[PDB]
């Protein structure tokens, strides 16, 4: 956030809480809009042997 400290004090007094601690606008703590690629694990039926479909 970014505002005058006297306005922050007035806000805290009127609301009764420290507003700055839990700001409702996301300034910079959220995840990046670009991420590394994933890998994604395969399922339990991805076996090469002992996997006849009639048993599952």
């Amino acid at each position: 956030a970014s505002a005058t400290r006297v306005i922050q004090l007035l806000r805290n007094w009127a609301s009764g809480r420290d507003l700055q601690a839990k700001l409702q606008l996301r300034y910079q703590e959220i995840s990046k809009r670009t991420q590394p690629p994933p890998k994604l694990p395969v399922g339990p039926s991805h076996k090469l042997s002992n996997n006849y479909y009639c048993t599952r």
């Binding site: 076996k47 090469l48 042997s49 002992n50």
Partner: protein, 216 residues
Amino acid sequence: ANVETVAVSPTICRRGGAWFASFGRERNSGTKLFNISGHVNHPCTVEEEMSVPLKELIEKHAGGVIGGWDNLLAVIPGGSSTPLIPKSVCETVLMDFDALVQAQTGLGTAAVIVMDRSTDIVKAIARLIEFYKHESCGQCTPCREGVDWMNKVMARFVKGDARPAEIDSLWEISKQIEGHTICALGDGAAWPVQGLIRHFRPELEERMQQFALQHQ
């Protein structure tokens, strides 16, 4: 009828069935032609009593294994269609139908192929599978497709390209082929692979490990 089966027919008649029987164990009567080839000092063919032990047959008529009997690695007792057996079994097994059935291989055509500790055991089985791939008539699905599939898998096994989880996979492929084909060529293609996997799995696994090591 097989040529050998017919040729003996008149001698059995003249001498009698009782005489012919007087040779070999029960249900294993008569004499037999054996072709001893591979890693033996004197490869040949010889007539012998049915239930002769394998070791006596190899060391007497064929001159033994090159490098001594302790140089022996494996023996295919009845031609390529029968599963191979290791030296642990070869030293005490009899050369008849029931005895070799109890050794999980089978007498086959009584064509002993000997391989010593100096051969690539996977390469020999791969060559046999290539023979079966080239000899399939192609009529039925399990043979026509699965024998070619097994040939490709085995050629990759020879190099070590595969992973251990494929070995069991290969086993199941053979099981699907065996007993599901019109002809018994599918059985003869699936049995050598089963023998190699049953008796020489660690060699396959270490070949895969080596290939991974120098390839990463």
